[PDB]
Design a protein around this motif. Structure first.
Motif, PDB file in Angstrom:
ATOM      1  N   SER A 138       0.822  -1.206   0.000  1.00  0.00           N
ATOM      2  CA  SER A 138       0.000   0.000   0.000  1.00  0.00           C
ATOM      3  C   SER A 138       0.864   1.267   0.000  1.00  0.00           C
ATOM      4  CB  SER A 138      -0.960  -0.012   1.199  1.00  0.00           C
ATOM      5  OG  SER A 138      -0.544  -0.920   2.208  1.00  0.00           O
ATOM      6  N   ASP A 139       1.993   1.238   0.712  1.00  0.00           N
ATOM      7  CA  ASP A 139       2.906   2.384   0.738  1.00  0.00           C
ATOM      8  C   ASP A 139       4.360   1.967   0.487  1.00  0.00           C
ATOM      9  OD1 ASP A 139       4.755   4.503   1.628  1.00  0.00           O
ATOM     10  OD2 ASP A 139       2.953   5.507   2.373  1.00  0.00           O
ATOM     11  N   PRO A 140       4.741   1.835  -0.789  1.00  0.00           N
ATOM     12  CA  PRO A 140       6.089   1.447  -1.195  1.00  0.00           C
ATOM     13  C   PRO A 140       7.196   2.190  -0.461  1.00  0.00           C
ATOM     14  CG  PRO A 140       4.695   1.403  -3.077  1.00  0.00           C
ATOM     15  CD  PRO A 140       3.884   2.039  -1.972  1.00  0.00           C
ATOM     16  N   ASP A 141       7.287   3.480  -0.738  1.00  0.00           N
ATOM     17  CA  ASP A 141       8.304   4.341  -0.152  1.00  0.00           C
ATOM     18  C   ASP A 141       8.566   4.062   1.338  1.00  0.00           C
ATOM     19  OD1 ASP A 141       7.024   7.231  -2.109  1.00  0.00           O
ATOM     20  OD2 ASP A 141       7.330   5.120  -2.612  1.00  0.00           O
ATOM     21  N   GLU A 142       7.527   3.672   2.067  1.00  0.00           N
ATOM     22  CA  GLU A 142       7.689   3.384   3.490  1.00  0.00           C
ATOM     23  C   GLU A 142       8.507   2.111   3.671  1.00  0.00           C
ATOM     24  OE1 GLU A 142       7.529   4.907   6.043  1.00  0.00           O
ATOM     25  OE2 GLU A 142       7.632   3.350   7.603  1.00  0.00           O
ATOM     26  N   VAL A 143       7.973   1.012   3.137  1.00  0.00           N
ATOM     27  CA  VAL A 143       8.627  -0.288   3.200  1.00  0.00           C
ATOM     28  C   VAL A 143      10.060  -0.089   2.740  1.00  0.00           C
ATOM     29  CG1 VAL A 143       8.643  -2.635   2.380  1.00  0.00           C
ATOM     30  CG2 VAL A 143       6.477  -1.420   2.594  1.00  0.00           C
ATOM     31  N   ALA A 144      10.200   0.625   1.634  1.00  0.00           N
ATOM     32  CA  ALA A 144      11.509   0.922   1.090  1.00  0.00           C
ATOM     33  C   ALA A 144      12.359   1.529   2.202  1.00  0.00           C
ATOM     34  CB  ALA A 144      11.376   1.903  -0.069  1.00  0.00           C
TER      35      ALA A 144
END
Lengths: 101, 147
Positions: free
Chosen positions: A35-41
């Motif tokens: 749902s939130d790529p940049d976060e996981v990234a």
DNA sequence: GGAAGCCACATCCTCT
DNA sequence: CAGAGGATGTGGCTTC
């Protein structure tokens, strides 16, 4: 914190009710979405002490699993992938049992 | 022909053949720095197949990519030949070129190239998930140690 | 102590 | 960008 492989890390965030915000199962088998790529990234880069880490690079790593048959991508569903290895035999929980917890 | 490409050809244990110089050390599956060529001194009709095989003590026959080429004008030009298989710590591969004439001919290039995964490199009761994932994330650790 | 190996990515990049 | 893959650097870590 010791040796850790991306597909395992993700598996953590997916077993941590706290993260459901940016990453969660989708209810279908072992499929899941970022749902939130940049976060996981962001977290992954942290767990690897890789500041510059982001999703463009993180998705590369995911791609290297296509061959190795650990994770496949779902056609059409942005940020949607799926564990294709036998997590049940590895951990013991059927998708629902785990989904429950 | 040696004048057009000085120091780019070398002699095989066969007097009728020459092959390009290979790097002492090279990364596995990486493309070579010089197209690999096998030159026939005698008369080899254009179209004859030429195959190369790499190997040694550890790997009898290492895995290669594009190890087959067609001889043309006394020269078999290999298109992006690559060494996939590894030669072993501090060891090299011995190439075995083989021109398929009639009868076939064999030429060797001993202790030719060392292939490694990095190649030449710049000097440097019931437990929970958490518990199961942990054991899992270590597997290679304990599995190797204990065994 | 440390060079030599192995491993999983980390970077980077071209298209579509 | 998102997404497939290739080329190649990087840092951890075991082996000699």
């Amino acid at each position: 914190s010791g040796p850790i492989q991306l597909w395992q890390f993700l598996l953590e965030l997916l077993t941590d009710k706290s993260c459901q915000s940016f990453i969660s199962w989708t209810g279908d088998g072992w499929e899941f979405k970022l749902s939130d790529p940049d976060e996981v990234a962001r977290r992954w880069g942290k767990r690897k002490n890789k500041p510059k880490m982001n999703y463009e690079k993180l998705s590369r790593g995911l791609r290297y699993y296509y061959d190795k048959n650990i994770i496949h991508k779902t056609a059409g569903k942005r940020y949607v992938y799926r564990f294709v290895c036998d997590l049940q035999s590895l951990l013991g929980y059927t998708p629902e049992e785990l989904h429950a917890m | 022909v040696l004048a057009d490409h000085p120091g780019e050809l070398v002699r095989t244990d066969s007097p009728n053949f020459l092959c390009s110089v290979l790097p002492t050390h090279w990364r596995c599956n990486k493309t070579l720095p010089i197209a690999f060529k096998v030159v026939a001194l005698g008369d080899v009709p254009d179209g004859t197949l030429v195959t190369v095989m790499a190997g040694n003590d550890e790997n009898y026959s290492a895995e290669l990519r594009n190890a087959t080429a067609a001889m043309k004008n006394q020269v078999a030009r290999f298109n992006d030949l690559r060494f996939v298989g590894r030669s072993g710590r501090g060891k090299s591969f011995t190439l075995t070129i083989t021109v398929f004439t009639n009868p076939p001919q064999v030429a060797t290039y001993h202790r030719a190239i060392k292939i490694t995964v990095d190649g030449p490199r710049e000097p440097r009761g019931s437990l929970s998930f958490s518990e199961r994932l942990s054991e899992l994330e270590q597997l290679r650790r304990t599995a190797m140690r204990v065994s």
